[PDB]
Amino acid sequence: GVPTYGAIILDETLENVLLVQGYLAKSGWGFPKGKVNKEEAPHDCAAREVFEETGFDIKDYICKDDYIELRINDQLARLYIIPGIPKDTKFNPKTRREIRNIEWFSIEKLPCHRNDMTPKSKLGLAPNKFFMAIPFIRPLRDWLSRRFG
Ligand X SMILES: CN(C)c1ccncc1
Q: Which residues bind ligand X (CB under 6 A)?
A: 90-92, 101-103
Q: Quick one: 9 or 36, whose CB is closer to ligand X?
A: 9
Q: Quick one: 75 or 101, whose CB is closer to ligand X?
A: 101
Is residue 53 a known part of a binding site?
yes
The DSSP result for the chain, as a single string, is ---EEEEEEB-SSSSEEEEEE-SGGG-SEE--EEEPPTT--HHHHHHHHHHHHHS---TTT--TT-EEEEEETTEEEEEEEE----TT-----S-TTT--EEEEEETTTS-SS--EEGGGTEEEE---TTTTTHHHHHHHHHHHHHHT-
CB of 91 to ligand X, least distance (A): 4
CB of 30 to ligand X, least distance (A): 14
Q: Quick one: 100 or 114, whose CB is closer to ligand X?
A: 100
Residue stretches of the annotated binding site? 49, 53
